[PDB]
Every structure is written in C-alpha cells, then in structure tokens.
Structure 1
Amino acid sequence: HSSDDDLLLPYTKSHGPSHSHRYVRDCQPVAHGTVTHETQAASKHSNSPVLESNIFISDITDDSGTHRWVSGHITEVHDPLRSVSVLEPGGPGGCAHNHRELVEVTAKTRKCLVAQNGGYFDTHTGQCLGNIISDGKLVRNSGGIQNAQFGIRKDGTLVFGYLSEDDILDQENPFVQLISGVVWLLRKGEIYINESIQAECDKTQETGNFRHFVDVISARTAVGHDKEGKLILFHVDGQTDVRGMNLWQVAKFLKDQNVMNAINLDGGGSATYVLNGSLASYPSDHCNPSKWRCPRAISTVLCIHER
C-alpha cells in the first residue's frame, strides 16, 4: 500500500472554482464565441487493432535551459465509442462508498488492455470529484462545477472542455462516458492553460497554488484526440518538483503529436499506467514500509478494452 506522499493538489480549499458555467462562457476569449466545449466525431476503424500503445523517453529542456529525461506512454485508440470506459473505483457503486483502489485492481474487473488513473478525488476521505458517467449510467453529478471535462456521447461524439449541468443531463444524444480533470491543456490545437486558470480557479489567493500546480514538474496524465478522432491517452512518470513535466510541457508535447483537444487528469503519485492488468510505470509514492515505490489507491479509471 502506498504512503500517498507525492500529492499534487490544485486547490487548497474546495475542489474547483465557485463560479458557474455562465461565468466561464462570459470570460472566455472572443475567438470561441458562446460555446465552451469542442466536439469531434470519433474514429471508427473496424479493420484496425483496438489500440496502439507506445513508450517514449524524451529530452525536455525547461525555461532555465535545464535538460531532463522523461519517460511515459502515448496510447492511440481507434474506435473509442466501443472501447473506452470510465470505471468507478473497485466496481460499480464504488464512488457512493468513498472507495479507493489501485488502477490495476479496477482494471482487471473489465480486462482492460490499457488503463490509467482517471479523475481527482478527496485525498483524505476518498470522495469522488467532478462529473462521472460510466457506461451510460450517471454516477456523480457535480452540480455544474466548472472543471475541464472529457466525454463520449451515444453517437460517438467526443467532447472536451467546459460543460453545464444541463449539458451532462441531456437526454438527446446522451453521454455514455464522462470524467472531469483540472486544466484544459489544448483547445483547437492551441495551448489553453492561461484560459483554464481563469475558468477553473477562483480569482483569490487560490491562484498562487493553482499556478504552482500548473508550473511545477511532476508525474502527469492526460486525455485528448487527434484530427481523425482517435482518442489519445498520455502518461509521464515524475515526482513533484523533481522529475516529470509541467502542464506547459505536456501541452506542447501533445501539440507536437497532433493532438487537437486535451485535458489534464490526476497526477503526482496518482499517475499510473497499467498494461493488461499489470503495473507498467514507475509510481512516485513510497510504499508504507520502504524506500520502494508503490502505486496509489485512486478513484475513477480510464479503461480501454475489447469492443
């Protein structure tokens, strides 16, 4: 069991901004009009593998000129409507019980080919956070908390960005999967982090810690899509302020991989990549009894499985 000692928290108080979807609409740049999310038809390649999972080891140079090697995975999903599931921790109903569980354990319940940790959660109580829809079922309605969202609609539409409560409750072309992160990294192929800071953080003293959350290097995970509508999962190992990538670096890395929209999921010691049910990354938390590293018990999971 992990010690939970690499905590990378975007908020010091309540999770998410306090302002409404309408506030987000009214503050976004004029280029985006009145619509606060993007849509893309998912790819639907029946004559292709379910996914391709690739390992990268790359040299990143930060602003100060310092070089660092980072390691991680990029996963490309060819038929997201059929193969992608947002899973509650442990099993259906896990969120109602404030249950936390390793990615690998949750992943095995659905024989996920690739699984990563998913959304944010209360690291003291285990409470789930954000909006959650799992295989067509509404698991958690945040009441319109304005954090970055990723969803899939019944007709295969991929959705990225900010959603109202009315949006997620829509019964026309309803969401079949939905999860929330913190920070919209890329919008229409451009870095959207400064816009995210304004949308997803209260304009208070909170912004200092939130900008640190953005600027510090750590382990990170993200989900996005490319121009063909393939879903892209991203993971990079790290440790807060010691190894890994900050969100500017993640967004640039994904942009160069031709990702068009992408959101940041949970990171730090939460970041986990699981291949066919086996841990296949280097987590940053220490195990309770040693100098060894241990995967963290987390909340929702993003699972890629056979159609």
Structure 2
Amino acid sequence: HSSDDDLLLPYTKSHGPSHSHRYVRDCQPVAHGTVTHETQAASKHSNSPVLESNIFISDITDDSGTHRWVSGHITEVHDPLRSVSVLEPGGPGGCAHNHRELVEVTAKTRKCLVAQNGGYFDTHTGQCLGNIISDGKLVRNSGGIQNAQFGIRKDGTLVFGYLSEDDILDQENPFVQLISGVVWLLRKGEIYINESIQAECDKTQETGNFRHFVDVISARTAVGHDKEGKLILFHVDGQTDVRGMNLWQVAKFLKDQNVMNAINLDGGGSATYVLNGSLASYPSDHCNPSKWRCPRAISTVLCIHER
C-alpha cells in the first residue's frame, strides 16, 4: 500500500535485547526494588460513555529552545476491561500468516470506535513481534524478550513494564490482552526513558542508534493509564527528523496529563488514528508512487469498541 519510507527503527538487526528478565531486575534502579512492572486496577465507570476522544494542537519546546506545532489525539477509556482489545492484523490468525493490513480494515472487523496501530513488526517479512494476547487467546510468545509491555488481566488489572516469560503464561489471573512496545515512557508518574535504554538495549547492540530512536522527532503512539485507572491512548502525527515529537517530549506531555505509566508503541509511518473505521490522522508514508500520503499496512491493532 504505502512506500514504507518513514521508517523509525530502534534496532538495526534483531528486534529487542538479548539479555534476560533477571538482568533487567539487576540493572533496575534501587528505588523500585526487585519488581519490574506496575499494576493498577482498571476503572469500571459503567455509567459513562465508552470513551472520550480529544484533538490537541500544541506548541512543543525542546532543550534547544526550538518551538514546534504538533497535532494528535488523546483518548480516555472508562471501562478498559470490557472495551479494549488487541487485534491481529486483518482478523484472527493474521500473525500466523505474517499478514500486514491497514488499521481501518482491521478495525472494521470489530466495529472499533477508536483504533490505533499497535506493536512493532518486521517490515520485510511481515512477522509479528513481541508478546501478543488477543481476547484471551495467546497469539505469540516472544520467549521472554525484554521490551516494554502493556496488558490487561481477567480481573481488570492493568499491567505496564517488563514481564518474564512465566509472568505472561500465568493461569491464576490470566492476561486477556497483551502487547509489546519499545521504551517505558513513564513509571509511577516519572520519566523512565534512561532506565528503558539500559533494559531494552544490550551490550551487543549499538546504543547510539537506539538513543537516536529516542531523541529524534517523529510520529509517535503510546498507551498508558491515569490516577483514576482510565486507559490513555496517545497519538501524535509526525515524520522522522522533520515533524512530531521525541520520546522525552511524549513523556513530559503525558506526565502533564496525569499519566502515571505508559509505554511507547510503533511510530513513524506506522502511526495511525482511525475514528469509527475512518482514517482521521495524517500518515507520513508516501503512496506508491505518488507524493500523496498513505497509511501503512501494519500488524497488531489497539481497538476500543462497545462494551
């Protein structure tokens, strides 16, 4: 569909770090003890609408003193357990076929009110990446790859952070939704990017390219939660090294929206915001072969649907 020309790649070769969850615990800062994740009971506002979606057009400043206009959406979800779903591309079984699909197409399979692009994927093979649990079904076990995680448990517990392979296979209170990103933006209402860089990039990888992935501006998406337990979906349009935000700016932006924990999902040309099946953002990838903009065929999708 698109030319795939706005690539925002955190890893030059193999996705994710090579070291184990135990290593993440050992390098993690003393302030957090030995637990490498955060939990929050999801809100249960059964008397509210499913969601509230807001458009922002904001003036962002960076350490250079430079000002930039940015535009995007913040989406608040009032009953995450009953309305949030991780979808495979195109429908159930998509990841098994290395299928890539537009967000709007995947979104129409479940009548999503708001849908955004989800996790990372191989742009050459279409292979899905990270851990994936869709509507209680386990879709992909990364094998303990230490990337920022977001999941919902059967009892409504929201989960953010780093999870071991055994964490996601637990049957006592099983995950019903699970998706992986890259970089833990906020932990306990504080910026956590430096810690993420140490945990999600290892000695055998070039930390420079990864730090550049963190520092460069581009289109970005993120998911988090607030003090009330509502789920926060973040999206900002951009183009790598031209428009949008870097992760430091996203973290500060969300921190000033009372977001307590959030992880960064796929961005660049993948960032998409679909409103009721209709593309409602400006993607960065050029079309094949025009200079028009085209949304990218991506992998998993974050869907917010009727309860």
Same fold (TM over 0.5): yes
CA distance in 2, matches of 1:166, 1:201: 21
Partner of 1:177: 177
Shift of 1:289: 2.1
Q: For 2:179 and 2:131, locate their aligned partners in 1 and report how far apart those are by CA, in whole Å.
A: 6
Deviates more, 1:57-66 or 1:208-217: 57-66
| CA distance in 2: counterparts of 1:12 and 1:303, whole angstroms | 29
Q: Secondary structure at the match of 1:212?
A: helix
Q: What SS is found at the alignment partner of 2:238? A: coil
Correspondence 1:242 to 2:242: yes
Q: Which residue of 2 aligns with 1:270?
A: 270
The CA deviation string for residues 203-229 of structure 1, in whole angstroms up to 9 with x for no partner, is: 245201000000000000000000110
For residues 206 and 160 of structure 1, what CA distance do their matches in structure 2 show? 26
CA distance in 1, matches of 2:206, 2:169: 30
Q: Structure 2 regions of 5+ residues with no counterpart? A: none
Give how far 1:64 is off: 1.1
Listed one character per residue, the Cα deviations across residues 125-177 of structure 1 (whole Å, up to 9, x for unaligned) are 00000000000000000000000000000000000000000000000110000
CA distance in 1, matches of 2:246, 2:301: 22
| 1:232-252 Cα deviation digits (max 9, x unpaired) | 000000000000000000000
* Structure 2 counterpart SS, 1:17: coil
1:180–1:205 Cα change, 3 Å: closer
Structure 1 Cα separation of the partners of residues 32 and 203 of structure 2: 21
| Residue deviations 1:255-280 (CA, integer Å, cap 9, x gap) | 00000000000000000000000000
Determine helix, strand or coil for the equivalent of 2:262.
strand
Distance 1:121 1:296 in 2: 12
Aligned to 1:116: 116
Shift of 1:63: 1.3
Cα distance in 2, alignment partners of residues 63 and 148 from structure 1? 26
| Distance (Å, rounded) in 1 between the aligned partners of 2:70 and 2:201 | 28
TM-score by structure 2 length? 0.99
Deviates most, 199-208 or 16-25: 199-208
Structural mapping, 1:147-296, within 5 Å: 147-296=147-296
Seq. identity, %: 100
1:13 shift after superposition: 1.3
Instruction: Give unmatched runs, 5+ long, in structure 1.
Output: none
Distance 1:198 1:167 in 2: 21
